[PDB]
Design an enzyme around this catalytic site. Structure first.
Site, short mmCIF file in Angstrom:
data_model
loop_
_atom_site.label_atom_id
_atom_site.label_comp_id
_atom_site.label_asym_id
_atom_site.label_seq_id
_atom_site.Cartn_x
_atom_site.Cartn_y
_atom_site.Cartn_z
N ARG A 126 0.86 -1.18 0.00
CA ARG A 126 0.00 0.00 0.00
C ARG A 126 0.89 1.23 0.00
NH1 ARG A 126 -4.46 0.92 4.68
NH2 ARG A 126 -5.46 -0.81 3.53
N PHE A 147 1.49 10.55 1.44
CA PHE A 147 1.18 10.05 2.76
C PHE A 147 2.22 9.05 3.26
CE2 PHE A 147 -2.88 11.60 1.15
CZ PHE A 147 -3.32 12.36 2.22
N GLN A 169 3.52 1.60 2.98
CA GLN A 169 3.17 0.62 3.99
C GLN A 169 3.50 -0.78 3.50
OE1 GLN A 169 -0.77 1.07 5.58
NE2 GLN A 169 -0.88 -1.07 6.29
N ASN A 214 -1.58 -0.78 12.26
CA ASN A 214 -2.37 -1.56 13.21
C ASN A 214 -3.83 -1.60 12.77
OD1 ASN A 214 -3.90 0.64 14.49
ND2 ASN A 214 -1.96 1.21 15.49
N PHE A 242 4.73 1.49 8.44
CA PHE A 242 4.68 2.45 7.35
C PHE A 242 5.80 3.46 7.50
CE2 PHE A 242 2.41 6.06 9.45
CZ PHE A 242 1.94 5.41 10.59
N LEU A 284 -2.26 10.70 13.11
CA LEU A 284 -2.01 9.35 13.61
C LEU A 284 -1.33 9.35 14.98
CD1 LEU A 284 -0.75 7.79 10.30
CD2 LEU A 284 -3.09 7.79 11.20
N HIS A 289 -0.74 5.26 16.48
CA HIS A 289 0.28 4.40 15.90
C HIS A 289 1.59 4.69 16.60
CE1 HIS A 289 -2.14 3.02 12.42
NE2 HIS A 289 -2.81 4.11 12.73
C1 LIG Z 1 -11.06 8.16 3.17
C2 LIG Z 1 -9.97 7.70 2.23
N1 LIG Z 1 -8.81 7.30 3.01
C3 LIG Z 1 -7.76 8.13 3.39
C4 LIG Z 1 -7.64 9.54 2.98
C5 LIG Z 1 -7.77 10.54 3.94
C6 LIG Z 1 -7.67 11.86 3.57
C7 LIG Z 1 -7.42 12.15 2.26
N2 LIG Z 1 -7.28 11.22 1.31
C8 LIG Z 1 -7.38 9.93 1.65
C9 LIG Z 1 -7.24 8.92 0.53
C10 LIG Z 1 -6.01 9.18 -0.31
O1 LIG Z 1 -8.38 9.08 -0.32
C11 LIG Z 1 -8.56 8.01 -1.24
C12 LIG Z 1 -6.91 7.43 4.23
C13 LIG Z 1 -7.47 6.11 4.38
C14 LIG Z 1 -7.09 4.97 5.09
C15 LIG Z 1 -7.87 3.82 5.03
C16 LIG Z 1 -9.05 3.81 4.26
C17 LIG Z 1 -9.46 4.93 3.55
C18 LIG Z 1 -8.67 6.07 3.63
C19 LIG Z 1 -7.45 2.59 5.75
C20 LIG Z 1 -7.88 1.33 5.33
C21 LIG Z 1 -7.45 0.19 5.99
O2 LIG Z 1 -7.87 -1.04 5.56
C22 LIG Z 1 -6.60 0.29 7.08
C23 LIG Z 1 -6.17 1.53 7.52
C24 LIG Z 1 -6.58 2.66 6.84
C25 LIG Z 1 -5.22 1.63 8.69
C26 LIG Z 1 -3.99 0.73 8.46
N3 LIG Z 1 -4.19 -0.60 9.01
C27 LIG Z 1 -4.11 -1.69 8.26
O3 LIG Z 1 -3.73 -1.69 7.08
C28 LIG Z 1 -4.54 -2.99 8.92
C29 LIG Z 1 -3.44 -4.03 8.89
C30 LIG Z 1 -2.16 -3.62 9.64
C31 LIG Z 1 -2.14 -4.50 10.88
C32 LIG Z 1 -2.62 -5.80 10.33
C33 LIG Z 1 -3.85 -5.36 9.55
N4 LIG Z 1 -5.81 -3.39 8.29
C34 LIG Z 1 -5.76 -4.05 6.98
C35 LIG Z 1 -6.96 -3.06 8.92
C36 LIG Z 1 -8.25 -3.49 8.29
O4 LIG Z 1 -6.93 -2.42 9.97
C37 LIG Z 1 -2.74 1.38 9.02
O5 LIG Z 1 -2.27 1.05 10.10
N5 LIG Z 1 -2.12 2.35 8.26
C38 LIG Z 1 -0.90 3.04 8.69
C39 LIG Z 1 -1.14 4.54 8.66
C40 LIG Z 1 -1.72 4.95 7.32
C41 LIG Z 1 -2.96 4.11 6.96
N6 LIG Z 1 -2.64 2.69 6.99
C42 LIG Z 1 -3.38 4.45 5.56
O6 LIG Z 1 -3.32 3.68 4.63
O7 LIG Z 1 -3.77 5.72 5.47
C43 LIG Z 1 -4.02 6.22 4.12
C44 LIG Z 1 -4.31 7.71 4.22
C45 LIG Z 1 -3.23 8.37 5.08
C46 LIG Z 1 -4.28 8.34 2.82
C47 LIG Z 1 -5.67 7.96 4.90
CL LIG Z 2 -5.61 5.51 9.09
#
Ligand SMILES: CCn1c(-c2cccnc2[C@H](C)OC)c2c3cc(ccc31)-c1cc(O)cc(c1)C[C@H](NC(=O)[C@H](C1CCCC1)N(C)C(C)=O)C(=O)N1CCC[C@H](N1)C(=O)OCC(C)(C)C2
Ligand SMILES: [Cl-]
Ligand SMILES: Nc1nc2c(ncn2[C@@H]2O[C@H](COP(=O)(O)OP(=O)(O)NP(=O)(O)O)[C@@H](O)[C@H]2O)c(=O)[nH]1
Ligand SMILES: [Mg+2]
Lengths: 166, 170
Positions: A56, A61, A64, A103, A114, A123, A127
């Protein structure tokens, strides 16, 4: 650095060498979380990051990765068991290069992590930050360019090799 | 001629939002879990003899990023509110979605369908009657679905289009 270990990832793009990223792990302030990442980087427990994917990547941002158990973004495991608790929130998401645990809510740290490419202060307190890029931020920026708004990467970004630098 | 509808699929992590959408769009069941950030799809269908273009916004289950989620709700015309029949927490989460939709859209009458997904599984924790009673209290339809078997998938999306059309008649 006199205290904090340094680990490296050799990053590959569809198998081809991209470059090396090294990280300072903040064992001085986040010892359990730093030690998990260190041991997963050396593979010394019999499992770890080598071969795993940055699944990812969202430009602006973060990059990951770390799911070496399910290989699909849902898995990972720590050196302490499947999950371990949030150790502390002493450090914050202050800018590019910050290394922090992914997480699924409170106390669900495993191996996913990440690398921030921007300040992600929303965050903070959720985190656990435990390291920072030392060398190779340019490589992280190169990785970031393979990502997209929905996180899907245009080429497969892997940890082709990893380990500890003395 | 035709019409176009902006449908938004919401619900807790892992309830099957993407699996439902992929069954509608691609006619196959995704067995693996690929957690969504955000995806959009388009499909031309005929519902009740009227051709329309469905714009489907497949959202992530996460509820942070209120600015983005508010925008999803402002632009959306109808909402598929999905829970999983083997996940009571996901069912308990439903009222939060309805309250947030009503708030963002400044209305007590927003087109919505309550979807109880994963009905093929033997691990049910939410009774059909429980979900029917909740849907009745909202005045919205309730549809049980399985993205795995395809049961109820078209029905859920087509019913949502009917709800939008009924709302536009007011
Ligand atoms: C609303 C759209 N939108 C946005 C967002 C916000 C503002 C502006 N524009 C956007 C995006 C570009 O518009 C398309 C984000 C975002 C994040 C998710 C979904 C939609 C999101 C998201 C989806 C997931 O499924 C999980 C998470 C976020 C948290 C993620 N946990 C996991 O992956 C866990 C696994 C890790 C442990 C084992 C399981 N898992 C799969 C679940 C279900 O928990 C995590 O820890 N991180 C680190 C820190 C970073 C996090 N991911 C991230 O990706 O943030 C993206 C941004 C910063 C852009 C935030
Ligand atoms: Cl998040
Ligand atoms: N047996 C069964 N499994 C289902 C059904 N719908 C989804 N699943 C499974 O449940 C898991 C989660 O499905 P998915 O559609 O990704 O859920 P989501 O609501 O989109 N999750 P997210 O909020 O992270 O995007 C996957 O393993 C998928 O195969 C269903 O009707 N029956
Ligand atoms: Mg999804």
């Amino acid at each position: 650095s006199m205290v904090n270990p340094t680990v490296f990832f050799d990053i590959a793009v569809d198998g081809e060498p991209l470059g090396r990223v090294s990280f300072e792990l903040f064992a001085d302030k986040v010892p359990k979380t730093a030690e998990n990442f260190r041991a997963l980087s050396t593979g010394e427990k019999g499992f770890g990051y080598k071969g795993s994917c940055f699944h990812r990547i969202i430009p602006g941002f973060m990059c990951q990765g770390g799911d070496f158990t399910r290989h699909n973004g849902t898995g990972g495991k720590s050196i302490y068991g499947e999950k371990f608790e949030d150790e502390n929130f002493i450090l914050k998401h202050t800018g590019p290069g910050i290394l922090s645990m992914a997480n699924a809510g409170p106390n669900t740290n495993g191996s996913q992590f990440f690398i921030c490419t921007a300040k992600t202060e929303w965050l903070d307190g959720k985190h656990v930050v435990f390291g920072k890029v030392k060398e190779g931020m340019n490589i992280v920026e190169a990785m970031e360019r393979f990502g997209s708004r929905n996180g899907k990467t245009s080429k497969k970004i892997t940890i082709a090799d990893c380990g500890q630098l003395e | 001629s035709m019409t176009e509808y902006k449908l938004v699929v919401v619900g807790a992590d892992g309830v099957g939002k993407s699996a439902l959408t992929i069954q509608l769009i691609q006619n196959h069941f995704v067995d693996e879990y690929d957690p969504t950030i955000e995806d959009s799809y388009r499909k031309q269908v005929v519902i009740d003899g009227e051709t329309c273009l469905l714009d489907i916004l497949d959202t992530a289950g996460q509820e942070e990023y209120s600015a983005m989620r508010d925008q999803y709700m402002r632009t959306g015309e109808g909402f598929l509110c999905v829970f999983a029949i083997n996940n009571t927490k996901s069912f308990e989460d439903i009222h939060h979605y309805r309250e947030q939709i009503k708030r963002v859209k400044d209305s007590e009458d927003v087109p919505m369908v309550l979807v109880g997904n994963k009905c093929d599984l033997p691990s049910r924790t939410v009774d059909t009657k429980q979900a029917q009673d909740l849907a009745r209290s909202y005045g919205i339809p309730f549809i049980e679905t399985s993205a795995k078997t395809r049961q109820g998938v078209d029905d859920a999306f087509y019913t949502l289009v009917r709800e939008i059309r009924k709302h536009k008649e007011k």
